[PDB]
């Protein structure tokens, strides 16, 4: 109901899940999917298969609003971070560019015990 | 800090003769000025401890030269102290 036909796609890939959002050139989202949106429930969500299907569910949802051109943004390291990208190029959506914007602090906040 | 303009003014005042830069009277005069520059810096900045250590070494060196002047020629020792207002 929007007819954007171009916009951005953010890939938030962690070790426990990979989730995909699709937005318009201004940043406001259109549709989205994840490993849990599709049937997977537990640790199967952070798998490259789940990352692939999650990328393709959001891609077909963006076809409804008429998306053709896509700029890709990637945040985080995790299994299926690359499988989500590869699934996005062959999703029919012509991928315009691919950027890695993973936030790295300047050593400002104390991590949890797990991360030290 | 302590510029060479102020530095030469002191050395020429306490020199035993023109051209004297190393007399015992000269070193004590020079030491005593840096003492007063630091002792006023430590009235404020009371929590500056690493600079406080440098002051203890200057006092020790000043009291070392004065204890020496006492032994050799006690007159120039009195003329020096009275001129600097010490002890």
């Amino acid at each position: 109901k929007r007819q954007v036909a171009s916009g951005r796609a953010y890939i938030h890939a962690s070790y426990n899940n990979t989730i995909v959002t699709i937005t318009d050139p201004d940043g406001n989202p259109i549709t989205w999917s994840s490993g849990g949106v599709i049937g997977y429930k537990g640790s199967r969500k952070g798998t490259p298969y789940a990352a692939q299907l999650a990328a393709l569910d959001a891609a077909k949802k963006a076809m409804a609003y008429g998306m053709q051109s896509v700029d890709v943004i990637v945040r985080g390291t995790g299994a299926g971070r690359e499988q989500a990208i590869r699934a996005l190029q062959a999703s029919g959506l012509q991928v315009k560019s691919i950027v890695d914007d993973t936030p790295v602090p300047h050593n400002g906040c104390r991590p949890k015990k797990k991360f030290r | 800090p302590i510029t060479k303009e102020e530095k030469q003014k002191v050395i020429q005042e306490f020199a035993r003769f023109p051209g004297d830069t190393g007399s015992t009277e000269v070193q004590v005069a020079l030491l005593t000025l840096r003492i007063n520059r630091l002792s006023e810096h430590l009235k404020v900045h009371k929590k500056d401890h690493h600079s406080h250590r440098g002051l203890l070494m200057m006092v020790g060196q000043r009291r070392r030269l004065l204890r020496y002047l006492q032994r050799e020629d006690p007159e120039r020792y009195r003329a020096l102290i009275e001129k600097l207002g010490i002890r």
Binding site: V74, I85, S97, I98, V99, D100, D101, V104 | -
Partner: protein, 70 residues
């Protein structure tokens, strides 16, 4: 690969305002290059780091950038 000092002129290492040359010493991201890639000496790199940080506060050099690849 060539190094930065190797392909350059006679420049002021202390000038924080010359972005055209200081852009050479930044990576694809806003990061400061290591000595292996700048070809600078020990005393030179320490001066460059402080002058790059100066330009960053004047809005002339970036703190960080975005990698367009992968």
């Amino acid at each position: 690969k060539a190094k930065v000092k190797a392909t350059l002129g006679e420049f002021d290492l202390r000038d924080y305002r010359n972005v055209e040359v200081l852009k050479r010493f930044l990576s694809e991201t806003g990061k400061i290059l290591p000595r292996r890639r700048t070809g600078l000496s020990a005393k030179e790199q320490r001066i460059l780091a402080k002058t790059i940080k100066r330009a960053r506060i004047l809005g002339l050099l970036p703190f960080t950038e975005k990698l367009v690849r992968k």
